[PDB]
Amino acid sequence: GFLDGKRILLTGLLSNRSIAYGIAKACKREGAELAFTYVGDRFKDRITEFAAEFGSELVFPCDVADDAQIDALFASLKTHWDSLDGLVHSIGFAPREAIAGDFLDGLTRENFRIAHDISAYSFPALAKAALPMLSDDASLLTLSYLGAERAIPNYNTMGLAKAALEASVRYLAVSLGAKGVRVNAISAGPIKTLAASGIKSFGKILDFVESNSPLKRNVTIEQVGNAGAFLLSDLASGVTAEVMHVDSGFNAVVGGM
Amino acid sequence: GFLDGKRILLTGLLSNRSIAYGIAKACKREGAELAFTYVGDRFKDRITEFAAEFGSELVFPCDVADDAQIDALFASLKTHWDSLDGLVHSIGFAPREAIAGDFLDGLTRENFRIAHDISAYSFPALAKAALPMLSDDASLLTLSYLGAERAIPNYNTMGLAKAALEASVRYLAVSLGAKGVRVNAISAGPIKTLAASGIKSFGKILDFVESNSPLKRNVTIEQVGNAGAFLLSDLASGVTAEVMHVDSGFNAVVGGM
Amino acid sequence: GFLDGKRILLTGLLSNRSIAYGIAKACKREGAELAFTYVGDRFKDRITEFAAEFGSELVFPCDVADDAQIDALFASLKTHWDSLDGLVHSIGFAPREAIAGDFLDGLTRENFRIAHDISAYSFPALAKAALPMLSDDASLLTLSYLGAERAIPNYNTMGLAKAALEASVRYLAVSLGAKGVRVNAISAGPIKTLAASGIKSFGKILDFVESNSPLKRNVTIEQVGNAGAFLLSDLASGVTAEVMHVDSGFNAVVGGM
Amino acid sequence: GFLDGKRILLTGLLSNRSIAYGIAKACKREGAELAFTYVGDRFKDRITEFAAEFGSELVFPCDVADDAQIDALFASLKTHWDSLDGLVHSIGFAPREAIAGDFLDGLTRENFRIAHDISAYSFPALAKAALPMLSDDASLLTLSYLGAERAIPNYNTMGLAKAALEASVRYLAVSLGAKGVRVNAISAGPIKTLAASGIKSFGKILDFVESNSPLKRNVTIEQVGNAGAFLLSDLASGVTAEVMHVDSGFNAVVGGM
Ligand SMILES: NC(=O)c1ccc[n+]([C@@H]2O[C@H](COP(=O)([O-])OP(=O)(O)OC[C@H]3O[C@@H](n4cnc5c(N)ncnc54)[C@H](O)[C@@H]3O)[C@@H](O)[C@H]2O)c1
Ligand SMILES: NC(=O)c1ccc[n+]([C@@H]2O[C@H](COP(=O)([O-])OP(=O)(O)OC[C@H]3O[C@@H](n4cnc5c(N)ncnc54)[C@H](O)[C@@H]3O)[C@@H](O)[C@H]2O)c1
Ligand SMILES: NC(=O)c1ccc[n+]([C@@H]2O[C@H](COP(=O)([O-])OP(=O)(O)OC[C@H]3O[C@@H](n4cnc5c(N)ncnc54)[C@H](O)[C@@H]3O)[C@@H](O)[C@H]2O)c1
Ligand SMILES: NC(=O)c1ccc[n+]([C@@H]2O[C@H](COP(=O)([O-])OP(=O)(O)OC[C@H]3O[C@@H](n4cnc5c(N)ncnc54)[C@H](O)[C@@H]3O)[C@@H](O)[C@H]2O)c1
Ligand SMILES: CCCCCCc1ccc(Oc2ccc([N+](=O)[O-])cc2)c(O)c1
Ligand SMILES: CCCCCCc1ccc(Oc2ccc([N+](=O)[O-])cc2)c(O)c1
Ligand SMILES: CCCCCCc1ccc(Oc2ccc([N+](=O)[O-])cc2)c(O)c1
Ligand SMILES: CCCCCCc1ccc(Oc2ccc([N+](=O)[O-])cc2)c(O)c1
User: Fold this and answer.
1) Is the separation of the CB atoms in A95 and A115 below 8 Å?
2) How far is the alpha carbon of C102 from chain B, nearest alpha carbon, in Å?
3) SUPFAM superfamilies of this UniProt entry (chains A, B, C, D) (predicted)?
4) In this structure, what DSSP letter does residue D133 have?
């Protein structure tokens, strides 16, 4: 496959509906060797089962709020892998208050801090901690959403954090690019995952994108996964600092009128 | 003038080269009544002199790192003004390490936190604290830079924070807009201010913009000030959620080839 | 006013609902001297009445399909004015077939040709013909629509032509900018004009923008006019190659979900 | 390969440095069946040799200035293929005057007409003529350049035409998407092809992109080809109305300062 030989670390695989699950499945199909992170002891058994499905026993804890766990992740990983070819950052979090209702009602200094720390800072933080073991043709991928670009109701503080995340893709690309490392994001359309499940208005967004996107259909983790595998691969060696929409074209219309 | 009657609070007026000085001068010319903030006791005399130049004795301390000072600012201001028509956010800060050299070399969780707290969070934080006294046709303005949109060497962590700031303009515009309040940014070209003065490569940026911008000249605080006054005024009542470039057109070219 | 002394030629003033009427009214208020173009003998009396309302008897025919009429326009104008400070291009046309229904159903080589000739080519064509008499601080303004940026149903071939028009703003800005001439567009929200009146779905667009824009209201020719006058003025001397949205913020949201 | 079974028609393969050659080579590798167009009798032998290299004898004349040749192309092709799965539009032209020197010096109504007719109109014109035989999962791809987005010296009238081309990608995506057909562009970085060879400043652009792009290297037709094959494939079934940069990240920086 077009990732033969490539060693790829994936964060964010929480259930079999996770975007990271789709990316894992496509990377394994194309020949990559995988490793996984998880957060919290109670998920160790579950992520171990997913790793095994993808032919791997490489699982490591990493809460990206914690500098020591980010350093320990790569210290552990390096006892197995000489080098790392791919990193998938599929991590987002804001306190519930901050993505419900009115933007200002949910705004506090701490809600802002936490949303930007986990959803944006953690991507270049993982990149920096990985760099000593990154291969020269490595590829780093994160997941963003259209709320970075345009204001979407309720996304609120997460939209600010995703805009900072997309900017980090560009500054990472410059930092890491003379070495040869590529950095990109997929701006994925709405997909019913665990994270999406806490958003009251999510059903309405899904209906709206189905009715108004050019392809008149919502995207799947298989579609996001295949685009992810492409970006992580040498097929995409001309592509860096890009935010690729995988959203049935929804970003490119004015819908619903 | 086209701001007659309007009461406008300006942050960030540090010296007579500050962008906020240019905006102050243009707003006063067009008829507004002004008030000012400062940070740190040693600047009280200086900002009092600037306020007096603009016919005002309304000066208030406000370090935007501190929730209590943000609340105290508007509690003080309201003992003078029933209502507020304009707010100018002209505040930026990152630790020096984070805007020098390589992006990852200057990246730490705390540098990221501080840059986003002061340069991005503080704008919607001031808006929220102001809201109880905002007039229905009020106008809020912040200052951004092209480094939000594209990666510029050394701007680094500030570019992430300005991307979050520009997103806050859009989410603020939606939050405050049913009331009638407008929210915009000016993406200003390079101007030799105190903040610019700590950037070793700033002379080179200024030369590059002079040689390659469409107007073949750098912008002034008078030009940024006039565009600011326009956005704060009822002339701009159709304009919200906008990031207006005031940069001699530099953002719109590929220069230097 | 802030256009005192400025001599401004306005195209596209067809009725008192025209965007060019709003721009005319704001420019006259701010002190400019005006001149006007029209298309077709039967409109000479009407445009003469509008010119007189704005204190001017300067009216000239100009169908922008015709090179000879574009040259004759400036030859005539120069017998009155030594120099020209402002040009407002408020001209759009596509054959009806090309802005109804499905994009491909309305697509033909000739419909494409005509839409791009009148709606896009004519702006830099007028600029070139004006250049010998442009003042060094002159300002050229055109009108665009969000359909240039994103696909909007029915706008179809006009969306292609407006994207070429917005690109012409950038290339004009570079061509004319060393002289000191600025070039900008306003991307106006929907306004019920004669041109809008032939679009069956226009009522629905107006309702949608009223419900979903940040300011929860449609824009007026007074709002577009005031932003136009600003851009044509020395207040905006730092601004060129810009496409300014004057659309109640609608461009910056995802609406209707 | 990931295009097994797919039948793809490629325009624009002029020499073995053509972008269309790279796309052809990658599509054949991934399993597609190919067909080719050419312009002008003297190139029939050459394109026949290229087709044979890709295991095909399917070659057809098509000058996209001529409606009859566009119709005859698909009438011919359909005698071989029941259905068409991919179309590569890799066609650009402007008169030499219009891409040299100053934008206005090279501007005439006819130069504008020709540049937009060949470089922009022809893409949706081919799509429309193909539609009766397009498969429901077909994929249409065109090639654009950063000069659509920002003004680049000398690109001039081609930049307007590429902006109209990128808009056609969005309107095509909506027109064709309910059927299931995807439409995208690659915005390719500079590559030394025959078309590039007539541009005096091209060496300087290539040097500038090598020095300033994030990956500090120019792109190849292999890189553009691999990204093209991806977009033409079912791997990219979530992606439509997208303009993908394949340019070593150059679009995302401000370079050369
Ligand atoms: N699902 C959608 O519609 C959609 C659309 C666009 C983008 N995104 C983004 O895709 C990414 C993946 O989310 P998903 O939808 O697949 O949901 P998910 O719930 O399957 O995955 C979210 C992941 O974030 C991880 N996470 C949260 N806090 C973390 C921390 N402190 N440390 C380490 N990991 C942490 C979770 O453990 C979980 O694995 C997120 O960045 C999300 O913002 C989701
Ligand atoms: N000067 C430029 O080239 C340029 C270009 C674009 C944008 N900007 C932005 O313009 C704004 C104004 O900067 P300037 O160039 O006029 O420089 P300046 O040095 O005159 O003003 C910077 C201001 O930030 C204030 N500030 C910093 N930390 C603060 C805190 N904790 N609390 C309250 N105020 C704080 C300072 O007191 C000072 O007044 C900043 O947002 C900057 O990012 C500057
Ligand atoms: N009304 C809207 O919602 C809206 C929104 C955005 C942009 N625009 C743009 O604003 C501009 C003004 O349109 P308007 O809405 O004020 O409508 P309008 O009908 O008042 O003005 C359209 C003008 O185009 C002129 N025109 C058409 N063909 C011409 C030719 N061959 N030669 C010279 N003039 C020609 C007409 O004479 C008329 O004056 C157009 O470019 C339009 O695309 C309109
Ligand atoms: N080479 C670059 O740096 C570069 C960068 C970006 C984009 N592009 C675009 O890539 C595309 C391919 O160009 P290329 O660089 O591979 O150059 P090329 O010279 O190899 O191909 C240009 C093709 O355009 C075709 N063409 C021109 N007029 C035509 C007509 N009337 N009918 C049918 N075909 C016609 C030519 O026959 C030729 O095959 C063009 O759209 C170009 O604008 C090129
Ligand atoms: C709220 C607006 C609708 C968003 C729809 C698409 C989407 C879905 C899930 C997304 O992922 C998350 C992850 C975490 C959290 N949260 O902890 O607050 C929220 C969202 C998202 O980014 C994006
Ligand atoms: C470093 C790249 C060049 C930037 C040029 C334009 C510019 C100048 C000053 C700018 O303002 C600041 C304010 C504070 C700090 N800092 O404390 O780190 C840095 C910058 C700016 O945003 C933007
Ligand atoms: C069709 C989609 C809705 C568009 C709404 C906003 C708008 C209104 C009027 C607009 O102006 C015109 C001018 C001419 C022609 N026409 O002759 O085909 C069409 C439009 C417009 O650009 C833009
Ligand atoms: C002139 C500015 C530099 C452009 C560099 C990248 C580039 C190279 C080749 C490109 O392709 C063409 C095709 C045809 C013609 N012409 O006939 O005038 C011109 C260009 C291009 O689009 C884009």
Assistant:
1) yes
2) 31
3) NAD(P)-binding Rossmann-fold domains
4) G
Under a CB-based contact definition with an 8 Å cutoff, are residues A22 and A229 in contact? no
* Residue A240 to chain B, least CA–CA distance (Å): 12
Resolution for this experimental structure (Å):
1.6
Give how far Cα A2 sits from Cα of A23, A231, D207, Å: 14, 11, 31
Asked if C111 contacts C32 with a C-beta cutoff of 8 angstroms, the reply is no
Handedness of CA A125, A128, A132, A134 (dihedral sign): positive
CA C51 to chain centre: 18
* Spatial separation of the C-alpha atoms in residues C9 and C56, rounded to whole Å: 11
D191 marked as part of a ligand binding site:
yes
C61 CB burial (10 A radius; 0-12, 13-18, 19+): middle
Tokens linked to A239 = 């592509």
- Residue D87 φ/ψ, nearest 5 degrees: -135, 125
3-state secondary structure of D247: coil
The residue ranges of every structural domain in chain D are 1-257
* D64 is an annotated ligand-binding site residue: yes
Tell me the three state secondary structure of residue D157: helix
* Half-sphere exposure (Cβ direction) of C52: Cα atoms closer than 13 Å: 6
Mutate to test the pocket of ligand 7, among C103, C199, C213 (most ligand atoms within 8 A of CB): C199
One-letter amino acid at B240 equals: T
- The CA–CA distances, whole Å, from C51 to C45, C58, C76 equal 10, 7, 16
CB atoms within 10 A of CB C43: 16
First to last CA, chain C: 44
Handedness of CA C170, C175, C176, C177 (dihedral sign): positive
Dist CA A121 CA A105 (whole Å): 24
b/e code A176-209 from CB counts within 10 Å (16+ = b): bbeebbbbbbbbbbbbebebeeebeebeebbebb
Compute the distance between CA of residue D21 and CA of residue A91 in angstroms, rounded to an integer. 39
The architecture of the domain spanning B1-257 is 3-Layer(aba) Sandwich (3.40)
The residue among D230, D234, D250, D251 with the most chain A CBs within 10 A of its CB, best to mutate, is: D230
D28 touches chain A (CB under 8 A): no
Structure tokens at B119: 């340069």
Q: Evaluate whether A173 touches D252 at the Cβ level (below 8 Å).
A: yes
d(CA D26, CA B24): 59
In this structure, what DSSP letter does residue A253 have? B
Token reading at B33: 């009544």
How many angstroms separate the CA atoms of A247 and A189, rounded? Answer: 4
Whose CA is closest to atom 20 on ligand 1?
A18
Report the alpha-carbon distance of residue B170 to residue C250 in Å, rounded: 10
Whether D190 lines ligand 8, by a CB cut-off of 6 Å, is: yes
Tell me how close the Cα of D164 comes to any Cα of chain C, in angstroms. 4
- For chain D, the distance separating the N- and C-terminal CA atoms, rounded to the nearest angstrom, is 44
Query: Hey, what are D208's tokens?
Result: 């500038």
Which residues touch D61 (CB under 8 Å, ≥6 apart)?
D37, D38, D39, D40, D41, D44, D69, D72, D73
Structure determined via: X-ray
Q: Does A102 touch chain B (CB under 8 A)?
A: yes
* Longest pairwise C-alpha distance within chain B: 56
Tokens describing residue D60? 């057809």
Collapsing DSSP states into helix, strand and coil, what is residue B218? coil
Option in A103, A121, A241 nearest B171 (CB): A103
